[PDB]
């Protein structure tokens, strides 16, 4: 098997063309057979199962996230399926158990899974909606990457950027990865031992234009607490949006569509203190139409988390720091520094007045692939 040393992160890199990536993602969904389409929905449903498994083993899950408290079940499921591509023996087996894909072995068919995740990506944007995923494989200087592994990540996303980097100076390493990712994407990012020789980071950007809405001129006060308050630019739209008021669990849900299959969900607790408990009831394994005038904050959010913290209860840190065998990734010594997910989430522009001027929960769902693309919590629209 041939190899190659990732170019040093300081080398010239042309920026990624998102509009060219979107055309590719739509092409992927366009040429999907019936079996591949069901496989995409299947993997979207399986990523949800993993996501719900992550909310059950976390009382306060959001101390894991740096910045905006947004979470991508599809990206977490893809980062694990991507690492499995380079795993062997015990490491591969333990990763396979976490994914729980009920398909016949080709070991798990990592190529079919990753190609299914890119399918749920293309299904969403093929309907205004912008979803982009790029993977950065950051390695110590001189570490040899195996070609079949890099080429298989391209099944997850056409944009794969392997670069070599000096991890000895660590605080500078985190700046170079951010200064590199922002220079090549134009987004905002965040990141965080000295033995490390590999950092496998997924960076995804979502931009959702809701039609029928508009950015109001004057801001409105957003109450982070009953004591503290901040003014925020607000979106405003009116239409027949699905809704439901849960009197038993005292919370209300609003579903405003993006497309025929993709929608945004908004869980508003009746009282502010119920936020963490209302979250437990919703994010875990009934709406009807109503004329609603929705007013919610314009969301320009950025956050990041290490899967080793999300899946600490699944012993992922042990999977990646004990008996490690990523020898399909590289023959050289691998010490995982971070397994990152960095999310740039943008939400931009008789009667029931629904106003999100208090902490709320949200989610982006797509019925095409029955996939929770994003779960999140907005205690403060500004960060």
Author numbering: 31 to 136, 141 to 161, 169 to 233, 238 to 330, 338 to 401, 417 to 450
The authors write:
Human blood pressure is mainly controlled by the renin–angiotensin system, which consists of several key components, including renin, angiotensinogen (AGT),3 angiotensin-converting enzyme (ACE), and angiotensin receptors. Renin is a highly specific aspartic protease that cleaves AGT between Leu10 and Val11 to release the N-terminal angiotensin I peptide. Cleavage of AGT by renin is the rate-limiting step of the renin–angiotensin system. To address these questions, here we have solved high-resolution crystal structures of human glycosylated AGT, its encounter complex with renin, AGT cleaved in the reactive center loop, and the spent AGT from which the N-terminal angiotensin peptide has been removed by renin.
The spent AGT retains a fold similar to that of native AGT with an r.m.s. deviation of 0.63 Å over 355 Cα atoms. Helices A, I, and J of spent AGT, which are involved in renin binding, have the same conformation as in native AGT. In contrast, there are significant movements in the CD-loop. However, it is notable that the rearrangement of the CD-loop in spent AGT places the side chain of Trp133 in the hydrophobic pocket occupied by the scissile peptide region in intact AGT, replacing the side chain of Val11. Finally, helix H in the spent human AGT is disordered with no clear electron density, whereas it is in a helical conformation in intact AGT. This may also be influenced by crystal packing; if helix H in spent AGT were ordered in the same conformation as in intact AGT, it would clash with the CD-loop of a neighboring molecule. A reduced stability of helix H in spent AGT could partly explain why spent AGT only has a relatively low binding affinity toward renin. Therefore, we conclude that spent AGT does have a product inhibition effect on renin cleavage of intact AGT; however, it is unlikely to be significant in vivo.
